[PDB]
Amino acid sequence: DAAIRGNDVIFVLKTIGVPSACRQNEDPRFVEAFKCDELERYIENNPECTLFESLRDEEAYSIVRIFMDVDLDACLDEIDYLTAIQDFIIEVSNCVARFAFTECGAIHENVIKSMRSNFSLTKSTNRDKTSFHIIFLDTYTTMDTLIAMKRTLLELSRSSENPLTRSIDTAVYRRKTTLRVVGTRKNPNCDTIHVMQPPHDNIEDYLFTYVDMNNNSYYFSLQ
Ligand SMILES: [Mg+2]
Ligand SMILES: [Mg+2]
């Protein structure tokens, strides 16, 4: 669609708690904008880095991929994890598609198809928990739409018997929100990272602000 442009510049914060003025003035001690190949190189050259992806100017442009931060503070047997991931995709796509259909004028079947057909999953290396980020690579909305969906997702987490669905962290749907970049640390005191998982090997597949639509992409927003 002519009214939808993409984004290939990834804005990252370099620590937790970056002051708003430093985001706005782009103080390089705190923030930097990268193309994906430059971001990969920065990570390789700064192995202590703690990077957090965020929208550079959400008032001007706020198209994002649907993403979830799943924070289960428990171990799962491998078979239970695999079954739960499959069920999670069904439950979450059904819930987003219903919301998109009723609140966004969306084509329900296109939300279902786009979300189920292409998503990336990280895995936290902390084996005492079941923590991951999921990005629906081909399902796009605006951040304000995700904020409007926050309570619907909260209610889904409270009604589900799936331990992963119950662990969706809905606090991430907010202005100036961040998602820690795959492969990087949270703080200088914790060495655990999220790793990529097959079949997605490219960093752009793990970024919620990277927008490169094609005919498989589906976009919806509040209407
Ligand atoms: Mg998390
Ligand atoms: Mg969280």
Residue 191 is which amino acid?
A: D
Reference 177, options 13, 14, 26; nearest CA is 13
N-to-C CA span, the chain: 17
Return the sign of the alpha-carbon dihedral for residues 33, 38, 40, 43. negative
Question: Ligand 2 centre and the CA of 210: distance in Å?
Answer: 20
Reference 53, options 77, 43, 44, 45; nearest CA is 43
Q: Mark out the alpha helices in the chain (DSSP H runs).
A: 20-25, 36-45, 78-103, 108-117, 143-159
Question: Ligand 2 centre and the CA of 72: distance in Å?
Answer: 9
CB 136 within 8 A of CB 213: no
Residue ranges near ligand 1 (ion) with Cβ within 5 Å: 69, 71, 131
What would you measure as the largest C-alpha separation in the chain, in angstroms?
48
Residue 162 Cα distances to 70, 105, 208, angstroms = 12, 29, 24
Catalytic center residues? 169
Domain boundaries, the chain: 10-219
How many angstroms separate the CA atoms of 78 and 192, rounded?
20
Method in brief = X-ray
Question: Ligand 1 centre and the CA of 123: distance in Å?
Answer: 10
